[PDB]
Amino acid sequence: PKPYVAINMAELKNEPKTFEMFASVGPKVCMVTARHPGFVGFQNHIQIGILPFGNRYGGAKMDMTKESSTVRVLQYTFWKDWKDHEEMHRQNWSYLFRLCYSCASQMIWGPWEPIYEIIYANMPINTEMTDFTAVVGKKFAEGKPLDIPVISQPYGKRVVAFAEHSVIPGKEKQFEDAIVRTLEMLKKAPGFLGAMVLKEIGVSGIGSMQFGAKGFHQVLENPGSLEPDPNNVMYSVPEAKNTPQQYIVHVEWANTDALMFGMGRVLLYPELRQVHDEVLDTLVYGPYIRILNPMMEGTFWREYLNE
Amino acid sequence: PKPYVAINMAELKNEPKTFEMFASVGPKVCMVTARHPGFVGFQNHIQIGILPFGNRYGGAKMDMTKESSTVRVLQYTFWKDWKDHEEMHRQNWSYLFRLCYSCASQMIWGPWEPIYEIIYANMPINTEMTDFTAVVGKKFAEGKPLDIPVISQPYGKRVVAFAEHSVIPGKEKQFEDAIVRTLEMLKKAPGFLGAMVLKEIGVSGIGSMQFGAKGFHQVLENPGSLEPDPNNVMYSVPEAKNTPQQYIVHVEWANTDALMFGMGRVLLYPELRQVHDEVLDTLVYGPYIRILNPMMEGTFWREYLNE
């Protein structure tokens, strides 16, 4: 079934010390997260660049890693029920907070952790180039050759287009119908590895280190080994849901060229352009498209998805 | 069905500033072109070199990019009807002309834009290496394994042999029959990714910036933001059709070695050599073979082709 998605967003210094701390702390955070039976996996992204749309963002490019002074991370964790995410944080607060605190010296912005429901998903399981033979064999054996997926390689060997949209209040349904039609047509593009639409349902105060006065002081005054009061979060997930409604259109591609011209199909192919125009008419903001590298992931979330 | 092909040809300075302007302007031109419902896609080529034919052109080689002071571009746009191309230019003149003008500082020759009908096509859809599993699965599911194409990777991950021919008046049919037989046999060569024969039907004056006196002065005197009178083109497409008849034999290959020895098959394999000799007997000019890299493309033109 469709899991809920929590996305922890942050901006840190782009220097080796930052990536060294990803390697030490990241695995720990994920392992603590896996303590909860509602946890169904994760997909961690590093932003490598921005889609320039010609020169609409002429100062940007798809790979800005060599020039950029900061690095932005977007950590997806997948949950049977979004409430599981909230429960996980509170049950494992002592570990989580102290782990995330060691990121402090590198933090510029964040963490900010919106929660999303998936209202549309066309996402295959990941496979390495070594696996396709067995996958093909098995699917033919069981008479389901139509279930043979594209090869979507895990661990930094494909790229993601992360497309931000905010929609005019009252136009949500028009956006949702048009985006689904758009993605259903978009899957014909070469190198297309899947897509899903995320609809924000709220924000996790605890995951965003957003407490009341008490917790705020505890955060600011912390030596690193004392938890803020996890009950000092002053709002529930839904209370923080944004209006205008926010969506993420998440599309995966074989490489940055397939991404560039693939996403471009909604602009270059007249038939698809007409359909995608219905999406554009509903927007307050966007589309703004970040290029992401899914470096670290628990691929089994797609197994939960496709069962 | 078979679309018509417009090929915008130009020669520019081989320097970074030239490629920077491709990235800013190219996408825009393509997007304006897609405004017309007759537009069915594009395939943009950079010439990387010339086929030396041993040492017949001993100063040349397949990859001359590192030494060359100029770059030649050949932009294919595909059209349901060639008249659509002409209509598109005129309907969107304000945008098109001002966009193509920003190429000015880099121009050495061109633009020159002949129009072609396709009289023969054996061209598959493009696919990335990640797609073949799903393509195989789908074709077997629908009982059409014979429709499984070779893997013809988009976005600069294959090469094109662009073979110029002009034919002795009265020998057109002999050329056309012999070239089709040749290409039907040539498809056995390893790394063969498809072929098509383009027959020139005329030239687009408006696409070639070839106006009467009035438009010419407007072009030369332009600050960049004023259009020449698009009605000052003094000839129709067919009026500019060349005699001797011109053809392009367009053949795609996995790599430059497969191209070199593949094209060479018409010279090295006695059986095919005899057939290809019938082509040679009809020529006023050629064969002259440019090596092209199809870097930017709207792959969906092949979908229109193969329906």
Added chain:
Amino acid sequence: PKPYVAINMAELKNEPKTFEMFASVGPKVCMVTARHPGFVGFQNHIQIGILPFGNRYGGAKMDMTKESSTVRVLQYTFWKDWKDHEEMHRQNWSYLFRLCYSCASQMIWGPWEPIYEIIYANMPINTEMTDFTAVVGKKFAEGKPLDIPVISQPYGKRVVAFAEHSVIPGKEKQFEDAIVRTLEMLKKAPGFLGAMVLKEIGVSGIGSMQFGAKGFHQVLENPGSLEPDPNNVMYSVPEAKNTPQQYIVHVEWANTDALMFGMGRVLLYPELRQVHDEVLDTLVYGPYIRILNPMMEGTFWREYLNE
């Protein structure tokens, strides 16, 4: 009388080895050509640049020799009858072919050798600065001071504007009348050293190394000392004549500034601009203007011209 003109065109690597082979082979080719009594001289050009027309060809300039990776040559040979050119090639094939073959290692494109009739000529004999005193003295002695020509120095000490035009079918007469009027007025410009209009009547297959299948294989397989069958040319000169009709407007100037502003007179002097506009209205292609340096020449062709 007016001779016919054969122009051998080729593009070679711009490196010392190329010019070294000009000095060894060129003289030989010219000496073999002089075996035929119909040969009345030659004028060999190196292209040094392209007229930018402001920034219409902004990447170009009049002298591109220092930056260019290639060099283009245009070798005019002059003939009492164009048939003499064809006869010369065949009578001296063994020498000619083997000589032109040694250019192989430097060839990028060509050779291509169109033939032209001169439909208008205002071209003086060449003289060195040392000669004018005797020329003046002689002309006054014989009572013909009006026959004292401008000083048109031979051997790379002046420059040529080589203006390509292709004309809309049915507009040839309008072009020819308007171009003659244009050149008759243009001769008032400072530094004007003469002009002529060349009208293509066909192409020499043998001079262009364009044979049937048999000759083509012989060319490609040649060790350098075996002639292709000179009777394997499959078309006559006129059979290759182009439609749209092609013309060369050949204008000579004291220097590149006199050329730039001189040619510019058809754009800058209202009276002449009106007349030249009639030329512009007839064009399919052009004007495209190459800057040439006439380095090596047999000046006596002008003696034949002006008798």
Added chain:
Amino acid sequence: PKPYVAINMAELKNEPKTFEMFASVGPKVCMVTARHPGFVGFQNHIQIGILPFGNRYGGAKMDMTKESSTVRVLQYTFWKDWKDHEEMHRQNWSYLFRLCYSCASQMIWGPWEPIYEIIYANMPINTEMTDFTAVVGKKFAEGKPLDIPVISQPYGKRVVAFAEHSVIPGKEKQFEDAIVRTLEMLKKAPGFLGAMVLKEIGVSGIGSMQFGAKGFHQVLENPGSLEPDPNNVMYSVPEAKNTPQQYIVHVEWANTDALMFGMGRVLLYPELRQVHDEVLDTLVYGPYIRILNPMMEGTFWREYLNE
């Protein structure tokens, strides 16, 4: 059917000038060779190294290209009948000799051109990685999945083990039976791309530049453009056949590691070792194994083979 094989062997200076002359002359020679209807293709090899057999040849290694002062070439040409090879040389002597003469400045040893019959062949057609999808599709379509070959990439993208053997007179049959059994078992090794056994039937004097006194003087005294008397070869092909009998065991592999451990299977796998021991017992000389790179080839010889 099984073609006959001529192998032109030579040793030249390992310097750029040598490879430059391969690119100019090689294509010509192969094109002249293709004049004969008995010509069914070629496979040209550069020796990159020697199989060291542990340290039996401790001074050698599989890739010696960076250190070696010479380069050895082995050019296979394939023929319907070995007599076709002899006829081809004589019919095209003037071209062939003059072409092969330009190699002179680089020659250290050779040319030497033994002729061979194929007494065993397990060799697939070549295919590029882009082709396998269509090959798979076609073979399943025609109900022959057993005829789907390994992917044996052409043009320098695989390697060859060239194993020299000479056999004790009277032991030929034992050698032939044991080598076939060996190769039938060897095909199980990973990366195995095919094998064949060549049995020498003679030597081509004309291909080896081995004439009588008259031809020898003509060779030594040649300016480069005069043929030795091709009728001055003093022996027929079979008259030069060697005793002890010579064989080449030609095995192709995905890469040098697969080659090393693959060939090693006859030494490391007890079962296969016992069988291969029967080969060893028959030998006067060998096995001596050269590592070859098949850079230039006419892949269609395998099409003739497998029909």
